[PDB]
Design a protein around this nucleic acid. Structure first.
Length: 156
RNA sequence: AUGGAGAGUUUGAUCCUGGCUCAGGAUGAACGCUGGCGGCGUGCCUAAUACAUGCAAGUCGAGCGAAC
């Protein structure tokens, strides 16, 4: 019903009074299995109760990503923090591979025609923030038609 | 619109302007070389570098005086 992508569970070796406190920050993408990105981080002792903790406290950070005719409406970027991304269009009837950054952004948008792009670095805390920067800065067909305030077939 | 766009760099993590140390192809090329065979092309790119040369291109009377 909901494509939840739990990337990893960052641990911490707290060097406080206690011998060695264990704090697992379960990282899970809050995707709605449609086209939204979704990102939430927990801090509970139980990963299962921590993964849903960030899914019930952070589920409004997603963005609606529409599709034209099976191809990305506009090749957007991502200038938020170090890690960056890029939207590359492909044919509707295609697929994705492995080797690079995060995979829970274009995989949520069941279309198999978008290539997930994010160089920046490996840090998965400032690389997903740039993906939502471009997703919210995406240009739609009518979205840009209102900008001019004329016809949809008069701005292409 | 066949539709660019990595980082670091600054506290103990940082955002943010800014500049390049640095994820590539190109390299009229040479290069230390392990450079099987070759179609095709460029070749004193360093050099209007100095000067022994082989060396510019020979002929003709329908119009005139060889021995022929």
């Amino acid at each position: 019903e909901f494509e939840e992508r739990v990337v990893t569970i960052n641990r911490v070796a707290k060097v406080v009074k206690g011998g060695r406190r264990f704090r697992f920050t379960a990282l899970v993408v809050v995707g709605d299995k449609n086209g939204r990105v979704g990102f939430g981080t927990g801090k509970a002792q139980e990963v299962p109760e921590a993964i849903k903790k960030a899914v019930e406290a952070a589920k409004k950070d997603l963005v609606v990503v529409p599709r034209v005719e099976g191809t990305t409406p506009h090749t957007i970027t991502g200038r938020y923090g170090s890690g960056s991304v890029f939207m590359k269009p492909a044919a509707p009837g295609t697929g994705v591979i492995a080797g690079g950054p995060v995979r829970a952004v274009l995989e949520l948008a069941g279309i198999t025609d978008i290539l997930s792009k994010s160089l920046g670095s490996n840090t998965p805390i400032n690389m997903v923030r740039a993906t939502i920067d471009g997703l919210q800065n995406l240009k739609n067909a009518e979205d840009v038609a209102k900008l001019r305030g004329k016809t949809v077939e008069e701005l292409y």
